[PDB]
Design a protein around this ligand. Structure first.
Ligand SMILES: *[C@@H]1O[C@H](CO[C@@H]2O[C@@H](C)[C@@H](O)[C@@H](O)[C@@H]2O)[C@@H](O[C@@H]2O[C@H](CO)[C@@H](O)[C@H](O)[C@H]2NC(C)=O)[C@H](O)[C@H]1NC(C)=O
Ligand SMILES: *[C@@H]1O[C@H](CO[C@@H]2O[C@@H](C)[C@@H](O)[C@@H](O)[C@@H]2O)[C@@H](O[C@@H]2O[C@H](CO)[C@@H](O)[C@H](O)[C@H]2NC(C)=O)[C@H](O)[C@H]1NC(C)=O
Ligand SMILES: *[C@@H]1O[C@H](CO[C@@H]2O[C@@H](C)[C@@H](O)[C@@H](O)[C@@H]2O)[C@@H](O[C@@H]2O[C@H](CO)[C@@H](O)[C@H](O)[C@H]2NC(C)=O)[C@H](O)[C@H]1NC(C)=O
Ligand SMILES: NC(=O)c1cc[n+](COC[n+]2ccccc2/C=N/O)cc1
Ligand SMILES: NC(=O)c1cc[n+](COC[n+]2ccccc2/C=N/O)cc1
Ligand SMILES: *[C@@H]1O[C@H](CO)[C@@H](O)[C@H](O)[C@H]1NC(C)=O
Ligand SMILES: CCN(CC)/C(C)=N/[P@](C)(=O)OC
Ligand SMILES: *[P@](=O)(/N=C(\C)N(CC)CC)OC
Lengths: 529, 532
């Protein structure tokens, strides 16, 4: 079958044909785009894959980059759907390509997916990132890569040449460079690449927006439940060096940078994973040890500084959030919370949870949060405290950082479309008090409901095809609308967004404008003084 | 001679007048001297009791208003002239008034003692709106009201000095209450059921008597209307009080600081009007709701600041009734806030809103000012002129009245005091102020005193029935410590439930929270900001 045979620049590839309820697609899985960053190349920037002879087996997903594996609810589908479904290895820099069957003979718009996972986990092989449905239903080319996470991707000894940091981000950029030189061989159009990602993936997208070497490798961005400007996606040079130095102490290696990292390179990958989470300064939720570092190279400044100073005329972006972004993170450290529970916390637990949810800030800053999120007519209602604390970590970490990004880019040339995903899947295993948790719009954007092997309803499948068309319309034209209630662009003044559920589109104003004026306008003034 | 118009108190004999009311006769003793005139060498000094006199003193009309400033902003306007002096100005002005039923009560009768407001720089017991004939006539009580020194004459302080110890306007009130305990029984009043009640600076004064032990033994209940002792305007530290007194002396010509006795003595040689003409040039900033000479926290009258006394006080066996009106901040904005006027709709721009915030909250850091802007901005309509207008009035009202009143009420309730709270939501048919001002500060007073029953006035019918209902509310609290009639009930205010009633033409409506969200900011968070 000649359709499964592609010659990229490194050599020849053999793909596989896959079935969907709407017809077949061509897939090429486990395409090597970098030399394996092992041994002496641990922590170093990625190197392009040297050419090979013969035919590369591109019929199965490759290995998952070494990462922590969640153990909180063993066997629970809500946690295991994000866990690795392939074996772990540092040899993990492969990407996957999905195109229609037979492969297009005309340039096709390309979508590049960057997975999330707090920069410590994730894999392009997860079932919920299956690109076969989007490609068949909307006739695009979908690409997805694996980038290093945790210490292997983002341990930085700033100023070092052996651990410069952000190497997980250059992994993504190298894949985007691979796209520009090779996607046309699959029928893709390298002059219409649309980045999209969720959570840390969405944050990774925005950082490519603000890094000029990456800007020439794609044309639009979709940021779902993530942003580069939040309080969790970046770290300073000094804190990055402290965390890298402590991890080395915890693994028995002596805190000279080059001998330090040389000793780290002698440690099995598993032992570094086992200690990465204990270099955090304080017991926290939504805080991660090894994230991108602001060191003047990849980002010449902090994301907020580059957002405020940038000219964004000629750029379209699609941004949004789920209804209850905070719900999911509080079962991982917030006092009194559990998924097998109503989690009707007390005031003591609420205030205790505020220091966990808003870590590393002064007492005054913490009390300011409590005042804004307390109903002083119902100061101790457990149901209200449960939802207020979810709003705290949800607004602080996702809703407000994204609302700021949307407002600034719109006011500075970019055309922005904003959504909030308000449908709770019928297959959701999480309790009802969590509502629509973080990350559970992805399965609908990838058309997972169309899989007849699953228990989604008829309306949900129609809903999935609605959002696939929205996303694909944006990739094709920079406008999600169908040329029906129209989706208006978000602006700093009107602050208009739409709600995505089984009902038709509903236009609303303000992404929690009151609560995010607190985080985006007042709090920064409070800490600097 | 009419025997009911002749009363013997300790100072000597008095003669009063017979007042005709719509409901019947009332005996009034207006202009009773209770202190020696604080003139010349006695200026700035504590009041001395009135020396006994021979013969009969004609206590038959209101005496002079204590020297004070006269408002000239809207000349001839009824809304401003009703607060201006209606008698001659003079430093000889320490006189009180007594209204009693005709004939005098057979048995002891509860006593209401009124303390007027005016930002501690103005006011007088003779204002038509404080006429006590209808209250005494309708509810058969004894109403006492006194004058006290305002402005620099009442509250200029050089702390530690003996020549100008400060707070002398408060001891004027205290001596008047001491007069009530010794002489009100001669009019038929009960010295062991005396209920203080005042409005604005009067209410702040009433509260400071709660927290100073020498005053607390002279009354039994309290009514605080649109004022509290803990507001950011009713007291001043010892140092700023000395700075204002010293520069007032400088601006008038004394000395040509130094020695207190020497400096005060030179101030005594200056005409009273000259002091009044300069007392507002000492305020540190352009402001509204700030007053140059107010009670000073010196450790004497108030051993500590009112907030700390309220928090450290045991108030068991004590009943107070507190409240505010619906739109408290509107009156003060036409006196300095940019873009405001009673003759316009005062639909300010956002630039004038932010400028108005600095006037409404003076002497605070830039961080605190922006914290105010955050909580009072509607970030979905940040520049709507109408919303900005009511936002600024909410800023002024909450910061200076509503929240101060709310914290006092909550701390008293939690520490053993039965509290009742209200919000006055009726806009009088005769109101001269524009519509955008709502129910302004100080306009519940005329309904409390029964003024609508005056036949010369053109109040509606229903407002008269309203006035009778509130007069009954106020009198029931005076007699029994509970405003309820022995109809829907008025529940006590507690720190948890925070229940209060609406006062208007419809029946009582129970509600929760006196701007709880807004005032949690003023009472709980903002005090933590200025510290750090
Ligand atoms: C909700 O449960 C939480 C979590 O407790 C775990 O999950 C429960 C289903 C049950 O199996 C518990 O035994 C588990 O430990 C409770 O929060 C815990 O409460 C226990 C005491 O009951 C305490 O010892 C733990 O420290 C708490 N853990 C945390 C993270 O706060 C909570 O009490 C339950 N809430 C209810 C029942 O309303
Ligand atoms: C502050 O001044 C008073 C007044 O001083 C008197 O009059 C002045 C014009 C000056 O010329 C002084 O010499 C006079 O004594 C002082 O109070 C007087 O103090 C003296 C001496 O202690 C005493 O004999 C008088 O009785 C006092 N007269 C009063 C109280 O009216 C006071 O001591 C001065 N304070 C200082 C200088 O710190
Ligand atoms: C509304 O009124 C204020 C008050 O101004 C005065 O009263 C008006 C009724 C009218 O008679 C004006 O001519 C008076 O000056 C206005 O604010 C003033 O505007 C003038 C004109 O530029 C300015 O010189 C003053 O400084 C302003 N005063 C303050 C306190 O800001 C206001 O412009 C009037 N109109 C509107 C639409 O707001
Ligand atoms: N070093 C790390 O960043 C890290 C963070 C969290 N975990 C474990 O995952 C907990 N968790 C798992 C899934 C979703 C949220 C969370 C809570 N994070 O604070 C391991 C390593
Ligand atoms: N003694 C003074 O010079 C003086 C000057 C200004 N004020 C303030 O008056 C303006 N004002 C401001 C707010 C409310 C009322 C009023 C008018 N009261 O008569 C008081 C005293
Ligand atoms: C969901 O699908 C599974 C397939 O493994 C099936 O066993 C289960 O019965 C389904 N649930 C419902 C409610 O149909
Ligand atoms: C991939 C989606 N998930 C798990 C639900 C997360 C945590 N995404 P993100 O990196 O949040 C920091
Ligand atoms: P309060 O003393 N009362 C005022 C200004 N007033 C005039 C309307 C009522 C007497 O203000 C602080």
């Amino acid at each position: 079958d000649a359709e499964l045979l592609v010659t990229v620049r490194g050599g020849r590839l053999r793909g596989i044909r896959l079935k969907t309820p709407g017809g077949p697609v061509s897939a090429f899985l486990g395409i090597p785009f970098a030399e394996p960053p092992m041994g002496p190349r641990r922590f170093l920037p990625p190197e392009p894959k040297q050419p090979w002879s013969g035919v590369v087996d591109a019929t199965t997903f490759q290995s998952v980059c070494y990462q922590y594996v969640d153990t909180l609810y063993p066997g629970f589908e809500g946690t295991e759907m994000w866990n690795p479904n392939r074996e772990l290895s540092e040899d993990c820099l492969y990407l996957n390509v999905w195109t229609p069957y037979p492969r297009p003979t005309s340039p096709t718009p390309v979508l590049v997916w960057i997975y999330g996972g707090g920069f410590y986990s994730g894999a392009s092989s997860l079932d919920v990132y299956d690109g076969r449905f989007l490609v068949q239903a909307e006739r695009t080319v979908l690409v997805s890569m694996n980038y290093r996470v945790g210490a292997f991707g983002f341990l930085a000894l700033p100023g070092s040449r052996e651990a410069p940091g952000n190497v997980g981000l250059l992994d993504q950029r190298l894949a985007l460079q691979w796209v520009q030189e090779n996607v046309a061989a699959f029928g893709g159009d390298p002059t219409s690449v649309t980045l999209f990602g969720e959570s840390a993936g969405a944050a990774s997208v925005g950082m490519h927006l603000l890094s000029p070497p990456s800007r020439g490798l794609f044309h639009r961005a979709v940021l779902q439940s993530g942003a580069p400007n939040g309080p969790w996606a970046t770290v300073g040079m000094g804190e990055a060096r402290r965390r890298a130095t402590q991890l080395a102490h915890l693994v028995g290696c002596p805190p000279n940078d080059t001998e330090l990292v040389a000793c780290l390179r002698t440690r099995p990958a598993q032992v570094l994973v086992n200690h990465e989470w204990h270099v955090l300064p304080q017991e926290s939720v939504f805080r991660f040890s090894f994230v991108p570092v602001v060191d003047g190279d990849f980002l010449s400044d902090t994301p907020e500084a580059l957002i405020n100073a940038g000219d964004f005329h000629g750029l379209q972006v699609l941004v949004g959030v789920v209804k209850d972004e905070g719900s999911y993170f509080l079962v991982y450290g917030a006092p009194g919370f559990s998924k097998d529970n109503e989690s009707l916390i007390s005031r003591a637990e609420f205030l205790a949870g505020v220091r966990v949810g808003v870590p590393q800030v002064s007492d005054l800053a913490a009390e300011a949060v409590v005042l804004h999120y307390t109903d002083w007519l119902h100061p101790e209602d457990p149901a209200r405290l449960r939802e207020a604390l979810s709003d705290v970590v949800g607004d602080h970490n996702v809703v407000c950082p994204v609302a700021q990004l949307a407002g600034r880019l719109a006011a500075q040339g970019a055309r922005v479309y904003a959504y909030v995903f308000e449908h709770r899947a019928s297959t959701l295993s999480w309790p009802l008090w969590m509502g629509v948790p973080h990350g559970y719009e992805i399965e609908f954007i990838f058309g997972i409901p169309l899989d007849p092997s699953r228990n989604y309803t008829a309306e949900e499948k129609i809903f999935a095809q609605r959002l696939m068309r929205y996303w694909a319309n944006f990739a094709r034209t920079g406008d999600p609308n169908e040329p029906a209630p129209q989706w208006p662009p978000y602006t700093a003044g009107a602050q208009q967004y739409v709600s995505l559920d089984l009902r038709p589109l509903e236009v609303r104003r303000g992404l929690r404008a009151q609560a995010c004026a607190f985080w985006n306008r007042f709090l920064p003034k409070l800490l600097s003084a």
